[PDB]
Amino acid sequence: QIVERFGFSEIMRSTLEKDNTVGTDEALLDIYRKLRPGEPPTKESAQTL
Amino acid sequence: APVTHIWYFKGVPSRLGYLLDLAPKDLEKIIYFAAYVITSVDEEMRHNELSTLEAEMAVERKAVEDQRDGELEARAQKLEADLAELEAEGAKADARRKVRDGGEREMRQIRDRAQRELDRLEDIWSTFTKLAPKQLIVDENLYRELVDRYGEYFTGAMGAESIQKLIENFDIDAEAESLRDVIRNGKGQKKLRAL
Amino acid sequence: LYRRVINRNNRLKRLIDLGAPEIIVNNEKRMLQESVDALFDNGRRGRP
Amino acid sequence: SRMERVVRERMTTQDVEAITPQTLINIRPVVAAIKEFFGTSQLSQFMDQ
Amino acid sequence: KNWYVVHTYSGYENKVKANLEKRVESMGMQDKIFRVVVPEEEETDIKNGKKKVVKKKVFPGYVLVEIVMTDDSWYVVRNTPGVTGFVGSAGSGSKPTPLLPGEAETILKR
DNA sequence: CGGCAGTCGCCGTCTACCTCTCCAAGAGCAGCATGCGC
DNA sequence: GCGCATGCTGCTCTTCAAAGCCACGGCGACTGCCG
RNA sequence: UCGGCAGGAGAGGUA
C-alpha cells in the first residue's frame, strides 16, 4: 500500500527499503519500546498506546 | 544512616567517580538502591577451594543430565507402548502424527528444561569465578544465590555505607604511581584519562 | 527542609530499632538520602 | 475536571440506594479555581484610573 | 503470588484498608485481591488502670496485602484514595519483589 | 576493539527609583447543646 | 419536666502524583553505536 | 521604671 501511494517520490522509497519492521504488531512493539522504556512490551498494551 | 554530599557526586565532572574510577550511572544506581557492588573478595579461599567447588558443580551437572535421560527414557517407553497399541485403529494416522509432533515437543520440553538448568549453573559458576572488587552486579536473584551458596569469601552491599567501605579500603599511593606510570609511557586516550 | 530531614530520620530510627524487613528499611534510607540532597541543593537531581 | 475525578473516585466506595446527586458533588475545587483566577493572576490586572 | 507491600500516608492505614475492602467487590475484581492486613501490635501500657493500647503500627505507613499480580491488580491497589505506591522494586518497579516467606511468617505471627 | 559524531546538560544574558495586591486546604475531632420520649 | 442521645462549627495537623506542560550561544563530557 | 518592631510572589511605570 505505502509503496503504491508514496511512489512518486524517492525519499519514501528509500525509507521503505530500510525500516526492517514489516508487521503491524512488531511496529506496535517498536514504538512501545520507545514511548514506554523499561516496561515489558505486550502487543495489547502497544495497541492501546 | 550515612548519606552522600550532593556537591561531590552530582557535578561536572563527578569527583567521587574520578576518585573511585566508576561511571556516574553506576554511582547513581548504587547510591539510590538500584544495584549491588562487590566491596571485597577473599581470593585465597577462592583459590584453594576452586577445584573442590568445580567438582561439586560437576556432580550437580551429571545429576541433572541423569534426571533428564531417566525421564526421557521413561517417556519414550510410555510413548512407544501407547503408540504401538493405538496406532489410529479407527481414524486416520494424522492424529498419531499430531501426537508424534507432540511427543517430539515433549522430548524438547524436558530437553529445554535441562538446558535452562545447565545455564543457571553455568552462569552462577562464571560469576563466582570473575568476582573482582568495584564490580557492579544487578539482578537480585543472582546476588541472593551467590550469597546463599558461596556466602563467604565475597562481601558487598548497596547504599552509601558501601561507598564508605570502598573509600576506607582505598590506597592513594598505589593508584597515584599507577596513573603516573600510565601518563609517563602511554598514548591514545588512556593518557588523557590519566591526566 | 529541616523538618523533612528530622521526620525522615526519626521514622528511620524507629523502624531500624524494631526488626523491619530489608525492603522497607532500604526504601526509608533512599527517602532520607533524597531529603538531605534536596536540603543541600534543591533541583539538582530529579524534580524540585 | 477536579470535581469530576473526586466524584468518580467516591462513587465506588459508598453504598447503593443511599447515593444522591447532592452527596457526590464537591464545590470546593471550583470556587478555589475561580478565586485563584480572579486574585493572584497575571491577566486580571489592577485598573488604572 | 505472594504477600506484597503498599505505602499509605501517615495515619491513613485504616482508611486504605476500608476503601480497598470496599473496592474489592464494588469495583469488580473479587478473585484478585484476597486478604488485606494493616500490621498492628498491642502496645502494653496503662495509666493507673485505665488502658490505652496505643495503635503502634509495627510498620507506620505501610499495609501488607496478599494478592495475585498481573495487570489490573497493580491498577486497583494503586488508585485507592490514600495509597501512595507499591513499596518494593529493583530500580524501576517493573515487577514488585514479594516478601520473603520467613519474614512474612514472623510478621503475621506477631 | 576503536573511533566517532551526535547529544545533552549546565553556565551566562545593564543600574537606580516609584505605586498596587495576595500568601494551604481538607478532614477529622472535639466539648457542648438542643430535641424527643415516657 | 427530666434525662439521654446525636450532631454544631472552630481548631488542629500533615503533606509523592499526575496531570500540566510546551530562547540562545558556547563548551565539554560521554555514550551508545556503527564499523 | 514597666513597656516596645521591619519576609516572599505577581503586575504596571520613570530616567
Look-up of cell digits 541472593: B144
Characterize the bridge pairing of strands E41-42 and E55-56: antiparallel
What are the beta bridge partners of residue E85? E7
Backbone angles phi, psi at C6, to 5 degrees: -65, -40
What's the grid cell of residue E99?
516478601
Q: 3-class SS at B181?
A: helix
Q: Rounded to an integer, what distance in angstroms lies between the CA atom of residue B24 and that of residue B4?
A: 14
Grid cell in block for residue E48 = 493507673
D-chain CB neighbours of E27 within 8 Å are: 12
| Angstrom distance (rounded) from CA B137 to CA B156 | 10
Other Cβ atoms closer than 10 A to B101 = 9
Identify the three-state secondary structure at position B32: coil
Q: Are B87 and B93 a contacting pair, CB within 8 Å? A: yes
E3-109 placed in CATH 3.30.70.940: yes
Q: Which residues touch strand H (CB under 7 A)?
A: D 40, 42, 45-46, 48
What are residue B36's DSSP bridge partners? B137
Using the structure block, give the residue that is written with the C-alpha cell 491577566: D43
Rounded to the nearest 5 degrees, what angle is found at the Cα of A11, between the Cα atoms of A5 and A12? 30
Q: Residues B122-152, buried b or exposed e (16+ Cβ, 10 A)? A: eebbebbeebeeeebbeeeeebebbeeebee
Strand pairing of E50-51 and B136-137?
unpaired
Q: Which set of grid coordinates corresponds to residue E20?
A: 480497598
- Is the CB of residue B23 less than 8 Å from the CB of residue B5? no
CB B135 within 8 A of CB B127: no
Q: Of E3, E27, E30, E7, which Cα lies nearest the Cα of E87? A: E7
Nearest to B72 by CA among B112, B110, B101, B114: B110
Do the Cβ atoms of B1 and C40 come within 8 Å?
Answer: no
Taking the C-alpha atoms of residue C46 and residue C35, their distance in angstroms, rounded to an integer, is 12
Q: Which nucleotide is nearest to D35 (CA to C1')?
A: F22
CA angle A13, A17, A18 (to 5 degrees): 120
Q: Decide if C29 and B7 are in contact by the 8 Å CB cutoff.
A: no
Q: What is the CA radius of gyration of chain B?
A: 27
- H or E segment to which residue A21 belongs: none
Alpha carbon of E44: minimum distance to chain A alpha carbons (Å)? 46
Residue position matching grid coordinates 512501545: A32
Among E67, E90, E78, residue whose Cα is nearest residue E1: E67
Query: Angle at which helices B140-148 and B95-129 pack, to 10 degrees?
Result: 70
Q: B41, B154 in Cβ contact below 8 A?
A: yes
Residues E40 and E43: their CA atoms lie apart, in Å, by: 9
The alpha carbon of residue B142 and the mean position of all alpha carbons in its chain are separated, in whole angstroms, by 6
> How many helices and strands (H and E) does chain C possess?
2, 0
What is the C-alpha to C-alpha distance for residues A38 and E92, in angstroms, rounded to an integer?
7
Task: Please report which helix (H) or strand (E) contains residue C4, including its range.
Answer: helix C2-16
**Dihedral sign, Cα of residue B167, residue B37, residue E91, residue C5:** negative
Question: Could you tell me the end-to-end alpha-carbon distance of chain E, in angstroms, rounded to an integer?
Answer: 22
Q: How many CB atoms lie within 10 A of CB D47?
A: 4
The amino acid at residue B130 is K
* D9, D24 contact by CB (below 8 A): no
Contact of E102 with chain B, judged by CB distance below 8 Å, is answered with no
First to last CA, chain B: 35
- Beta strand ranges found along C1-48 (DSSP E): none
Q: Is B144 helix (H, G, I), strand (E, B) or coil?
A: helix
**Residue E35: beta bridge partners?**
E66
DSSP E35: E
Backbone angles phi, psi at E17, to 5 degrees: -60, -45
Resolution (A): 3.2
HEC-encoded secondary structure of D3-43: HHHHHHHHCCCCCCCCCCHHHCCCCHHHHHHHHHHCCCCCC
Q: Do C29 and B31 touch (CB under 8 A)?
A: no
Q: What are phi and psi of B112, to 5 degrees?
A: -70, -25
* Distance between CA atoms of residues A20 and A3, nearest Å: 14
Q: Does D29 contact strand F, using a CB cutoff of 7 Å?
A: yes
The amino acid present at B188, given as its one-letter code, is: G
Beta bridge partners of E47: E50
Tally of CB atoms within 10 A around A4: 6
- The answer to whether E99 touches C23, Cβ cutoff 8 Å, is yes
Beta-bridge partner residues of D22: none
Q: Could you give the CA distance from residue E34 to residue B151 in angstroms, rounded to a whole number?
A: 36
Encode burial over E2-38: b for 16+ CB neighbours within 10 A, e otherwise. ebbbbbbeeebbebbbebbeebbeebebeebbeebeb
What DSSP string describes B34-76? S-EEEEEE-TTHHHHSHHHHHHHHHHHHHHHHHHHHHHHHHHH
What are the cell numbers at B97? 502424527
Are the beta carbons of C41 and C25 closer than 8 angstroms?
Answer: no
Determine the length of chain B.
195
C-alpha dist (Å) from residue E6 to B73, D19, E20, E102? 49, 30, 12, 19
Q: How far is the CA of D7 from the C1' of F36 (A)?
A: 36
Find cell 541423569 and name the residue: B66
Q: How far is CA B27 from CA B33, B169, E93, in A?
A: 10, 17, 19
D31 CA to H11 C1', in Å? 23
Task: Report the alpha-carbon distance of residue B28 to residue B136 in Å, rounded.
Answer: 12
Q: Which residues, other chains included, contact E12 with Cβ-Cβ below 8 Å and sequence gap of 6+?
A: E82
- Non-local (6+) Cβ contacts of D33 within 8 A are D2
Residues 6+ apart with CB under 8 A from C15: C24, C25, C28, E59, E60
Residue B119 makes CB contacts below 8 A (sequence gap 6+) with none
How large is the greatest C-alpha to C-alpha distance in chain B, in angstroms? 87
* Distance in angstroms (rounded) separating the CA atoms of residues B38 and B50: 19
The Cα E24–Cα E72 span in angstroms is 12
Question: What residue has cell string 606510570?
Answer: B181
- Which residues on C lie below 8 Å from E99 (Cβ)? 21, 23
**Residue A37, amino acid:** P
Q: Which sequence spans correspond to the domains of chain E?
A: 3-109
Paired sense of beta strands E65-67 and E3-4, if any? antiparallel
Q: At C22, list the grid cell.
A: 530489608
Q: Which residue has the cell 489490573?
A: E72
- E78: nearest Cα among E25, E37, E23: E23
E61 Cβ neighbours under 8 A, 6+ residues apart: C11, E7, E8, E9, E10, E13
Q: How far is CA D27 from the centre of its chain?
A: 4
Q: Is-cis flag, bond preceding B133, omega within 30?
A: no
Do the Cβ atoms of E20 and E45 come closer than 8 Å? no
| Nucleotides of chain H touched by protein CB (<7 A) | 9-12
